[PDB]
Design a protein around this nucleic acid. Structure first.
Lengths: 39, 21, 81, 137, 463, 183, 96, 37, 88
RNA sequence: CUAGUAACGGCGAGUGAAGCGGCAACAGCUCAAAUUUGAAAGCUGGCUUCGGCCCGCGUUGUAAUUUGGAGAGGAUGCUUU
RNA sequence: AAGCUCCUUCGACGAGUCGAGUAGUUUGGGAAUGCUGCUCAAAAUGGGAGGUAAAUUUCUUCUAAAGCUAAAUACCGGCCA
């Protein structure tokens, strides 16, 4: 639906966001399980 | 000599000059 | 289809060296004493591939016996693209 | 069970030793000496210095290793160490010098490769915290 | 009072005298003498009050007084929302610097990146730039702008409405601020407009309102026409319209001055006498064309839509919008009422492609009446064969066709209302058929997981 | 512009059409002589960028060379051996350049471009008539071709300090005791 | 007075002449060489070819002085030249 | 620069529970000497 | 050290002396489709289609010899899988 | 000259540069990557009354234009044979 | 025919070659100093070589796998003085 008569109508994450020690933005990621794979 | 080389020698040849003291 | 292709293409044969020289002697004589663009058949691999890439060609004919065949392997697919 | 640990509680650890593109035979021999002692590690060589530091992470994620020991060489003369917990854990940087390798015939000692060591730490590795983080690493 | 009353350079005053302007308009009188003094100006005029001459005169005089040379780089940057008014200021700047030795250039979107980079490093002194391409050049290309002394932001309200909030806030943070005059103009005063003023202008501006507050935006007394025409017979319908509606008054609106130039030369070869109004003409020839048209009985005039916004439309029998309008709100209200034209019966129509019928839904939302015309297929004058023989053989018409085709597509890409004017719903083979091409010439139609083990940047001089 | 498509094809020479063509051509070349004459180059893009022209005086010769070790290693490359055998065969021509054309489990196959210095189509062309000079007799024996310059280490830099001006000329210069008059 | 800090403004005196250089008690050889440099020269004016004059005269004989129509003409201007090129060739041949 | 609290904070996230309360010596085999050396 | 008025240089025409033109990328995409795939690339394509992306990055590394080349090859072959699926 | 310096060394024997700097001499270019496509415009031979005729090479590419601190194509106006 | 200027137009740059492992050789020179052989075998905001603890590979400088070219240099031989 067109709210305004000639204006344009308005319109996977592998991290968690924490705070780091100095104060900022820290990404913690999925840990890796230490196994030998089949190859 | 090539045609490109003759064209450059025709229009920009070595000149004759001197430098004053 | 090959015979009907060469029926049209023979009508657009390029001028030979004998009759190109004759026409040059005709026009030079008239200067001593008015035409449109010539429509011929285009040839030459490097020329035709460029005519393909600029979409300037309408029909392409490819020889089946080019003995380095790498010169013509991409050419059916390039015309398709 | 895939982590090949036969124990009451499994200590799932893996390291990935690596080399820069300009190490010397003295720095190359320290790969061969350390990795021979280190039984749960893989050898890899010639990491591109034009790459980024965090491309050492998915290199280790490719080989399922939560530790990385990088030998980085500058000028073709200087060894720099890196110990790091690969997914998100802390890292360290050292300057390594005064190198003496196992191939030099003056040590007169030998041991099994892959045998378990005792870790002989120091007293300052406990009291001062900047030694404590590298202690766990 | 007049231009001669100001004490300008005799190089500049000779240029104004050849352009024909003797009397200064409202904004020209109230803005230029404080701008020559050095004070920053905040203007609130609509386009066509003479504002394009109001900021160019101080910028030209600054460059002439300081004796600018091409090695010095840019002295003044004029920021313009879309490329059509950027090319409009270019023609005005060409007429101003006819006698000067300073250089002048255009940076626009949908143009060659590398040719602009060679132009910018070679050294332009007055630069008319669209905001997106200016930030690209300021961030990537090596050119001199350390001596920037003037900044002009023309039609600010369109710039934020188009969507250059982030870009223009980065533009004023990379350009030098000290010893600089910044002049800002906008027709309306919205909330985003003053935040652009607080970041660009100095703490003391000068406030000028020469606005037309009596905006007679009619809501009901209008009737809009439209013709649904396929993309490959747009010109043939224009030609058949103009041929049969000769002995009448016709005004046609295009989207680009390059398409006006090409259609002017083609219609003379196709033998239809049509008048023209584009930016590659003299300013004097521009006025004598329109004065001839306003007093004529019959005739037909081609101009761009941004040219008519600055011009006084006379009583005409039709207003036809061949290309899509620049801003659809100003087309429906202002140009619909001027087509109605006081007393005489004047009708307005708009060319629509089949992929453009959401305009009807937008027209239905604002509740404005429509009538669509039928146009039987027999009465189309199929001069397509004559047109393609001309383009394939004449070299000057081939250049004009290529530039008109590209400017039509490039203006289509940089359209504000992208819901109905979308270039990805355009069959480019058919739209080059109308321009006279069998093969559509090449044009760039465009002009989840983050890194594992990665952390945000904290240090390093990453440039 | 057909030759741009050929340049990308030679890049992908493990691929299906190029492995097929290299297989069927290596089979054909094994029944042929060790050194034989080719009417046209098998890779016309490579020959042309190496200097080949379709003129009277340019010939193409194909040669197979045994591959493996000489653990003694022959410092002469297989490409340089390919050049030297053809120049012996054609003592009247000049070896211009050579390129890889095929390989097998026992042999490596090279095509060499030669120029006739006595053909007066060659003698009249300023782009090629430098080779008519007698300082270019048997360039493949003196290491003056592209294979020879690689194996002689004639490259700029600190890596090629011993060989960039001639290796033996560098050794003779550094091993010379230079005595002046006023010492 | 240097508003823009230009290190080249003091040494002043984008197209330049490409073939020559527009230049500004002593020994006898130097004075003799200066008379050779400053000696007046021969113009050696090139001339239009005979067929070129016939092509241009045919254009005047049809269109007069309208340079726009001459460039736009196709029969008498086969190699399509702009009016700026035709105007220079007309002014050289004396046909305005 | 030596942020102290953040240093031990990073130590917690990689701290193994090495303690003779539950973990025997065979697990870690890490010895810390009393002498400073 | 010493302070000098640094100038802005004209762009060197030898910047990016390889390819960034749209014509060369057209040729490479055409030749790759008309020539086929190498034997090792068929192995990686099979593993990438089966989801064994972990094995595919390792296998390209032993064949090419460098991790950086192994990433680019697996990226190029992944795009081929994407545009072949859309055409199907 | 650097300089018996750096470097490598049964670290014994020893081996052993280069950059910078002062000089001598100075010089820059040719291709491949492009469609001449409104005209293979190029070239080897032979016969020749020496003036210009034939064969052949060559489009799987011989001329002209271009060679990345470039260039092409338009436009414009001066300057060169 | 040629040089420059301007630009709402374009701008192609060398692969069994780099590179990875390995063996021989060689160098003051395990980024192999270089080369060669064998196995595998690339890229296009690309590649090479540097610089840097400075906090991430920030920056610097060149474009390899085609080719020509006088002078300054050597000289127990050739024609002489």
């Amino acid at each position: 639906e067109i709210l305004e008569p000639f204006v344009d109508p308005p319109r996977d994450r592998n991290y968690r966001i924490e705070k780091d020690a100095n104060g900022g933005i820290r990404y913690v990621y999925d840990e890796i399980d230490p196994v030998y794979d089949s190859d | 000599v090539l045609e490109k080389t003759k064209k450059r020698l025709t229009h920009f040849p070595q000149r004759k000059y001197a430098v004053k003291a | 289809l090959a015979a009907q292709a060469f029926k049209l293409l023979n009508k657009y044969r390029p001028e030979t060296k004998q009759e190109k020289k004759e026409r040059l002697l005709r026009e030079a004589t008239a200067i001593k004493e008015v035409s449109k663009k010539p429509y011929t058949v285009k040839y030459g691999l490097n020329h035709v591939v460029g005519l393909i890439e600029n979409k300037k060609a309408s029909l392409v004919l490819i020889a089946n016996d080019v003995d380095p065949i790498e010169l013509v392997v991409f050419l059916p697919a390039l015309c398709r693209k | 069970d895939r982590s090949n640990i036969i124990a009451e509680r499994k200590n799932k650890q893996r390291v990935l030793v690596l080399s820069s593109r300009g190490v010397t035979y003295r720095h190359r021999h320290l790969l061969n000496d350390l990795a021979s002692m280190l039984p749960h590690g893989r050898k890899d060589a010639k990491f591109d210095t034009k790459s980024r530091l965090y491309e050492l992470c998915e290199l280790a994620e490719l080989y399922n290793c939560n530790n990385v020991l990088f030998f980085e060489a500058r000028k073709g003369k200087d060894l720099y160490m890196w110990f790091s917990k690969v997914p998100n854990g802390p890292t360290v940087k050292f300057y390594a010098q005064n190198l003496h390798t196992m191939e030099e015939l003056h040590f007169q000692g030998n041991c099994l490769k892959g045998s378990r060591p005792i870790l002989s730490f120091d007293a300052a590795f406990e009291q001062e915290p900047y030694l404590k983080v590298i202690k766990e690493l | 009072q007049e231009f001669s009353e100001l004490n300008l350079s005799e190089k500049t005053t000779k240029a104004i005298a050849e352009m024909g302007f003797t009397k200064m308009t409202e904004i020209q009188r109230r803005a230029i003498p404080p701008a020559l003094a050095g004070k920053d100006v905040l203007g609130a005029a609509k386009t066509g009050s003479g504002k394009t001459l109001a900021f160019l005169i101080p910028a030209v005089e600054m460059l002439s007084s300081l004796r600018f040379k091409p090695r010095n780089g840019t002295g003044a940057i004029v920021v313009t929302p879309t490329r059509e008014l950027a090319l409009q200021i270019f023609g005005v700047a060409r007429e101003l610097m006819k006698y000067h030795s300073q250089t002048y250039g255009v940076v626009i979107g949908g143009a060659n990146r590398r040719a602009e980079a060679e132009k910018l490093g070679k050294g332009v002194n007055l630069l008319i730039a669209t905001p997106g391409r200016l930030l690209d050049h300021l961030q990537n290309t090596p050119f001199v702008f350390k001596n920037l002394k003037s900044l002009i932001i023309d039609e600010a309200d369109r710039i934020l409405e188009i969507g250059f909030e982030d870009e223009m806030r980065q533009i004023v943070k990379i350009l030098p601020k000290e010893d600089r005059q910044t002049m800002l103009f906008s027709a309306t005063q919205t909330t985003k407009v003053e935040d652009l003023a607080r970041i660009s202008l100095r703490p003391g501006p000068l406030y000028i309102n020469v606005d037309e507050e009596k905006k007679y935006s009619t809501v009901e007394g209008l009737e809009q026409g439209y013709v649904v025409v396929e993309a490959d017979k747009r010109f043939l319908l224009l030609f058949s319209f103009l041929k049969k509606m000769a002995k009448k008054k016709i005004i046609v609106f295009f989207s680009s001055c390059n398409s006006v130039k090409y259609y002017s030369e083609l219609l003379q070869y196709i033998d239809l006498p049509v008048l023209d109004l584009h930016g590659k003409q003299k300013q004097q020839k521009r006025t004598n064309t329109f004065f001839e048209f306003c007093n004529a009985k019959s005739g037909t005039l081609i101009c761009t839509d941004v040219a008519a916004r600055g011009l006084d439309i006379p009583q005409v029998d039709w207003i036809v919008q061949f290309d899509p309008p620049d801003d659809p709100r100003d087309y429906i209200h202002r140009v619909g009422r001027t087509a109605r034209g006081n007393n005489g019966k004047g009708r307005s129509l708009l060319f629509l492609q089949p992929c453009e019928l959401g305009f009807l839904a937008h027209l239905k939302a604002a509740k404005v009446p429509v009538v669509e015309y039928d146009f039987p297929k027999n009465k189309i004058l199929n001069v397509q064969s004559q047109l393609e023989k001309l383009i394939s053989t004449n070299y000057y018409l081939n250049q004009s066709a290529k530039e008109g085709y590209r400017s039509y597509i490039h203006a289509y890409a940089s359209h504000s209302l992208r819901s109905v004017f979308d270039v990805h719903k355009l069959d480019l083979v058919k739209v080059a058929k109308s321009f006279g091409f069998s093969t559509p010439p090449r044009v760039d139609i465009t002009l989840g997981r983050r890194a594992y083990g990665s952390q945000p940047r904290q240090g390093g001089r990453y440039k | 512009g057909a030759l741009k498509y050929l340049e990308e094809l030679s890049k992908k020479k493990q691929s299906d059409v190029v492995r097929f063509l290299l297989r069927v051509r290596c089979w054909e070349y094994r029944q042929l002589n060790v050194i034989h004459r080719a009417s046209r180059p098998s890779r016309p893009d490579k020959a042309r960028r190496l200097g080949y022209k379709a003129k009277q005086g340019y010939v193409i010769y194909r040669v197979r060379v045994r591959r493996g070790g000489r653990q003694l290693k022959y410092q002469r490359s297989l490409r340089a051996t390919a050049e030297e055998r053809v120049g012996r065969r054609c003592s009247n021509l000049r070896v211009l350049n050579s390129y890889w054309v095929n390989q097998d489990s026992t042999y490596k196959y090279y095509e060499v471009i030669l120029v006739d210095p006595n053909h007066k189509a060659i003698r009249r062309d300023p782009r090629i008539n430098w080779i008519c000079n007698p300082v270019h007799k048997h360039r493949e024996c003196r290491g003056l071709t592209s294979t020879g310059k690689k194996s002689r280490g004639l490259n700029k830099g600190h890596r090629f300090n011993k060989t960039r001006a001639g290796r033996r000329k560098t050794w003779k210069r550094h091993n010379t005791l230079s005595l002046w008059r006023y010492r | 007075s240097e508003s823009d800090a230009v290190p080249q403004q003091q040494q002043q005196e984008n197209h330049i002449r490409q073939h020559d250089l527009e230049l500004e008690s002593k020994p006898e050889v130097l004075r003799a060489l200066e008379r050779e440099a400053t000696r007046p020269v021969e113009k050696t004016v090139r001339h239009q070819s005979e067929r070129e004059r016939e092509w241009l005269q045919r254009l005047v004989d049809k269109h007069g002085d309208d340079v726009a129509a001459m460039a736009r003409d196709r029969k008498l201007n086969p190699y399509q030249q702009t009016a700026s090129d035709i105007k220079r060739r007309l002014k050289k041949a004396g046909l305005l | 620069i030596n942020n102290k609290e953040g240093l031990l904070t990073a130590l917690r996230r990689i701290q193994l529970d090495i303690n003779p309360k539950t973990t025997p010596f065979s697990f870690h085999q890490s010895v810390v000497a009393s002498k400073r050396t | 050290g010493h302070k000098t008025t640094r100038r802005v240089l004209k762009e060197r025409p030898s910047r990016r002396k390889g390819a960034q033109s749209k014509r060369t990328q057209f040729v490479r995409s055409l030749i790759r489709e008309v020539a086929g795939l190498a034997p090792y690339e068929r192995r990686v394509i099979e593993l990438l289609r089966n989801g064994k992306d972990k094995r595919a990055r390792k296998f390209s590394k032993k064949k090419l010899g460098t991790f950086g080349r192994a990433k680019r090859k697996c990226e190029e072959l992944q795009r081929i899988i994407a545009e072949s699926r859309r055409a199907h």
